[PDB]
Design a protein around this ligand. Sequence first.
Ligand SMILES: [Mg+2]
Ligand SMILES: [Mg+2]
Ligand SMILES: [Mg+2]
Ligand SMILES: [Mg+2]
Ligand SMILES: [Mg+2]
Ligand SMILES: [Mg+2]
Ligand SMILES: [Mg+2]
Ligand SMILES: [Mg+2]
Ligand SMILES: [Mg+2]
Ligand SMILES: [Mg+2]
Ligand SMILES: [Mg+2]
Ligand SMILES: [Mg+2]
Ligand SMILES: [Mg+2]
Ligand SMILES: [Mg+2]
Ligand SMILES: [Mg+2]
Ligand SMILES: [Mg+2]
Ligand SMILES: [Mg+2]
Ligand SMILES: [Mg+2]
Ligand SMILES: [Mg+2]
Ligand SMILES: [Mg+2]
Ligand SMILES: [Mg+2]
Ligand SMILES: [Mg+2]
Ligand SMILES: [Mg+2]
Ligand SMILES: [Mg+2]
Ligand SMILES: [Mg+2]
Ligand SMILES: [Mg+2]
Ligand SMILES: [Mg+2]
Ligand SMILES: [Mg+2]
Ligand SMILES: [Mg+2]
Ligand SMILES: [Mg+2]
Ligand SMILES: [Mg+2]
Ligand SMILES: [Mg+2]
Ligand SMILES: [Mg+2]
Ligand SMILES: [Mg+2]
Ligand SMILES: [Mg+2]
Ligand SMILES: [Mg+2]
Lengths: 88, 71, 115
Amino acid sequence: PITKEEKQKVIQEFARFPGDTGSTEVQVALLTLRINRLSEHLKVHKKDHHSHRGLLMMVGQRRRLLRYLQREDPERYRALIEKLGIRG
Amino acid sequence: RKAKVKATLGEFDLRDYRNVEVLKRFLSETGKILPRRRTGLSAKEQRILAKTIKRARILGLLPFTEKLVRK
Amino acid sequence: KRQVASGRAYIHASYNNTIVTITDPDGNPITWSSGGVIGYKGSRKGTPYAAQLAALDAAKKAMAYGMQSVDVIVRGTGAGREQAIRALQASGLQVKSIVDDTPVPHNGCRPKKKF
RNA sequence: CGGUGAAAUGCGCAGAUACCGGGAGGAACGCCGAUGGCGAAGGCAGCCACCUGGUCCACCCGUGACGCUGAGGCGCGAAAGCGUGGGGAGCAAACCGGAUUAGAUACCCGGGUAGUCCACGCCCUAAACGAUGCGCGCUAGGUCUCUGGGUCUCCUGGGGGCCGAAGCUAACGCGUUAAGCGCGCCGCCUGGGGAGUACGGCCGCAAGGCUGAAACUCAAAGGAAUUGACGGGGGCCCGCACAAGCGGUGGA
Ligand SMILES: [Mg+2]
Ligand SMILES: [Mg+2]
Ligand SMILES: [Mg+2]
Ligand SMILES: [Mg+2]
Ligand SMILES: [Mg+2]
Ligand SMILES: [Mg+2]
Ligand SMILES: [Mg+2]
Ligand SMILES: [Mg+2]
Ligand SMILES: [Mg+2]
Ligand SMILES: [Mg+2]
Ligand SMILES: [Mg+2]
Ligand SMILES: [Mg+2]
Ligand SMILES: [Mg+2]
Ligand SMILES: [Mg+2]
Ligand SMILES: [Mg+2]
Ligand SMILES: [Mg+2]
Ligand SMILES: [Mg+2]
Ligand SMILES: [Mg+2]
Ligand SMILES: [Mg+2]
Ligand SMILES: [Mg+2]
Ligand SMILES: [Mg+2]
Ligand SMILES: [Mg+2]
Ligand SMILES: [Mg+2]
Ligand SMILES: [Mg+2]
Ligand SMILES: [Mg+2]
Ligand SMILES: [Mg+2]
Ligand SMILES: [Mg+2]
Ligand SMILES: [Mg+2]
Ligand SMILES: [Mg+2]
Ligand SMILES: [Mg+2]
Ligand SMILES: [Mg+2]
Ligand SMILES: [Mg+2]
Ligand SMILES: [Mg+2]
Ligand SMILES: [Mg+2]
Ligand SMILES: [Mg+2]
Ligand SMILES: [Mg+2]
C-alpha cells in the first residue's frame, strides 16, 4: 500500500503553506502517487480488470483538478506539472 | 429455544482458532457448523466464528465431518 | 471355516436394491447378501421386505461362521434401510451399535442430468 | 450388480457389486448460508498470505464551484463458439445401443466425441431484467434486516426488504430504493406482418455481429383488467358415482 508515513511526506512536499492538508496541488500530488502505485501493480497483474476501472477514475479526476488549475493560476499549473512530470 | 450456546459459555475470543474446548460446542453430532438458530450468535459473530472453525479444522483440531451414531 | 466372535454389518441401500455384507472386526467381508441374491429380479429388490430378507440371509450365513455380535454401519437413504436394521436387530445377533455414514460430497462432481 | 412405471442395452466366474487399506488424477467447495454481503455491469462464496479497486461512519481540519451529463472514441462484457498449446475425474451437444410408442426419428435407460477446466489471443451477443439512464433537491409513517457513530430506553448516518400518507397510473401497481413533485444532460420510440430480412458499409480467422430498409399485405397487432368456460391446477362438499354387497344383461 502506501503507509501513512509515506503519504504524509508527499503532503508536506507539495503543501502550499505549513499545515495545508489538501489544496489543489496536494490533491493532485496524493492522487498522482496512488496512480503510479496502482499502474505499477497493473503491469504485473494485467488481469485485474476491475482495479483498472478505479484507475481511469483516479486519472480522470487528476485531469479535472489540473484542468481547473490551468484556468485558475496557469503558473502554479506549470510548476505542479513539472514538479511531478505529467502530461505525456 | 432448545439451548443457546451463547449463554452456556462465559466470554471468549471468536477469532481464537485454537480454543478447541470452546469451538467443539458450535458443531453438531456431525462436524457440521451449527446454524445461527442454535448458536444464538450475532450476525457479525457468526461470520467470524465461521471462519475461525474453518481455520481450526484445517489445523487438525476440529473435524470436517463426523458420523452419526444412533444414540 | 474360520470363527468370528464379533463383527461388522454394513448396509448399503439404494432406491433400486439393498446389499448387506458382513465383515471381520478388521472390516474384511465374510459373507454377504442382497435383494437379488434372495432371488428377486428388478423393481422388487429395492423393498423393505426384500431388504428384510437380504439382512436375514446375511446374518444366517454369518452365524454359521460363528457370528455372535455385530456393529452396524448403514450407508444411504432408501427403502428398508430401517427394515434391514430391525431385521438384524431381531435376527439373533446382538446389535452393539448403529451408525450412518452416507457419503455427502463437500461439493464435487456434477451429477447426472436427472440428479 | 446396475437400471426403470416395468424393462432391456451394459457390467460380472479374466471374480463385478458390497467391505477394508494403499496410490494417482481432475474438477467443484457440504455445514456456516440468510428471504444476507460486495461489485458499474457481466458477475463474485473451503482456507492462507501477498498485490489491488470501490465504499461507509465519526472529526468538521485543508482546498474554494474545482460541479453534472456525455455524439463519437477507449476499456469491461454470462454461456455457447473460434485458433494454438496443455489438461480430462464427473458431466455431456452430435453420434452409438437399449426401451417406449400407432410411429419416436424425442421425453426414460446404458455408452460416448466436441465441450465443460488452465494459459494466451479472438468472438461481443442475452429475458446482458428492476424488462425502470445518470446526477441533484423536495414530498407522512410503520415494520424486518446487513453495516457504521452517540449524551448508545432511544437518537443519528449508509444499504437491503415488506406495508402504506400525499400524489401518480389504462390498470396491475409505484409510493424517501418513486413509476410522486421539479431542473440538467444522454439514449431510444412513431401501426402489425414482411424482418432483425434485403441492399450498402464496418468489424470478424470462422460461426457470424453492429448499422438497417422498402415493395407488398393486413385492419388490426397490442397492454392491463372483467365475466365465463375449460385444465392430464389446487381446496372443501354431494349423488347407488366408485367401493361393499344381492340379483341380472351380454350366451340360449
Ligand atoms: Mg477404496
Ligand atoms: Mg488420468
Ligand atoms: Mg448492488
Ligand atoms: Mg444477476
Ligand atoms: Mg472546515
Ligand atoms: Mg480563498
Ligand atoms: Mg479560505
Ligand atoms: Mg463523473
Ligand atoms: Mg461521464
Ligand atoms: Mg465473452
Ligand atoms: Mg466459455
Ligand atoms: Mg478451445
Ligand atoms: Mg485442444
Ligand atoms: Mg435412438
Ligand atoms: Mg444419455
Ligand atoms: Mg454417462
Ligand atoms: Mg454527512
Ligand atoms: Mg442503525
Ligand atoms: Mg432505508
Ligand atoms: Mg408498496
Ligand atoms: Mg391513495
Ligand atoms: Mg430521496
Ligand atoms: Mg415514466
Ligand atoms: Mg417506421
Ligand atoms: Mg408498416
Ligand atoms: Mg439489430
Ligand atoms: Mg441476431
Ligand atoms: Mg440482435
Ligand atoms: Mg449485409
Ligand atoms: Mg475477413
Ligand atoms: Mg450493441
Ligand atoms: Mg392479457
Ligand atoms: Mg377442480
Ligand atoms: Mg359395485
Ligand atoms: Mg355379475
Ligand atoms: Mg339374449
